[PDB]
């Protein structure tokens, strides 16, 4: 099966760590805990954030453009992604937005955290239709002196 | 592309403050983060602040926590780092550098992974 993980402000904006104003170690926690030993496909511009493999995951990045580190395996189309995590229970595709948008359709599972921020951005998880989801977990964290904002995990199945 | 220009290094006595600026030649987007190193003769070069330009969130090297600030001016398009209660072993050539390598790597990420580097500017604390 493919998954979505993501982490979303108010109205689904969404993007990298350097743009956005919260700071939430539980969430990379979660983010880890959800993701160690599954392949992750990814996006060029979430590598650059990144700047090294997430380690214990098969680090996969989708560009139609050559890949410019031997560390990871580069594809250049989704079915192309697809194939190179090879047969596993779960493929995770960590973002951003645009491969969001390019892997949801092929996607059963959601792993989304609800951050409690509203902020100015141009980049959005895709509108998923939610009345298509079926919520199976959700778990409320109020901010404290590690996590800069409350923050609300969710896991969604595909009806 | 970017260039980075820093400025305000120089010679102060130990216990003095000392503020260092960083300009950019072109804008930074909400991606990128700023920062700095610093190197001294011998040594190899170590991480001391780095700010995120969307978020404006910081991390410091553990050397500088407490004494050093770093911030940024979107509109100005300018970083600062502001050094307090200076000591000895913070002479160094400060380097200003950016990269859309997420902020919070900045204090492990080999240097030569960040691509947009200034020339360094000199500081120099005395006993």
């Known amino acids: 099966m493919i998954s979505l993980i993501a982490a979303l402000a108010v109205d689904r904006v969404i993007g990298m760590e350097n743009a956005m104003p919260w700071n939430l170690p539980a969430d990379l926690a979660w983010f880890k805990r959800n993701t160690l030993n599954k392949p992750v496909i990814m996006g060029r511009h979430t590598w650059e954030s990144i700047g090294r493999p997430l380690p214990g995951r098969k680090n996969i990045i989708l560009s139609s453009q050559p890949g410019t580190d031997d560390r990871v395996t580069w594809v250049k189309s989704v079915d192309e992604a697809i194939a190179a995590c090879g047969d596993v229970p779960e493929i995770m595709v960590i973002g951003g937005g645009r491969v969001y948008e390019q892997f949801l359709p092929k996607a059963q599972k959601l792993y989304l955290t609800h951050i409690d921020a509203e902020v100015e951005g141009d980049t959005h998880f895709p509108d998923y239709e939610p009345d298509d989801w079926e919520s199976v977990f959700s778990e409320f964290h109020d901010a404290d002196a590690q996590n800069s904002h409350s923050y609300c995990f969710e896991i969604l199945e595909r009806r | 592309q970017v260039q980075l220009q820093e400025s305000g290094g120089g010679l102060v006595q130990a216990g003095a403050s000392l503020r260092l600026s960083c300009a950019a030649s072109?804008?930074?987007?909400?991606?990128?983060?700023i920062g700095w190193f610093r190197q001294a003769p011998g040594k190899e070069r170590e991480f001391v602040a780095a700010?995120?330009?969307?978020?404006?969130?910081?991390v410091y090297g553990e050397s500088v926590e407490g004494r050093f600030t770093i911030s940024r001016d979107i509109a100005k398009n300018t970083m600062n780092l502001q050094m307090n209660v200076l000591r000895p072993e913070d002479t160094a050539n400060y380097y200003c550098?950016?990269?859309?390598?997420?902020?919070?790597?900045?204090?492990?990420?080999?240097?030569?992974?960040?691509?947009?580097w200034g020339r360094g500017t000199q500081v120099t604390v005395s006993s």
């Open positions: 700010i995120s330009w969307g978020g404006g969130l910081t």
């Open positions: 072109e804008r930074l987007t909400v991606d990128y983060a």
């Open positions: 550098a950016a990269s859309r390598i997420s902020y919070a790597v900045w204090n492990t990420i080999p240097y030569n992974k960040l691509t947009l």
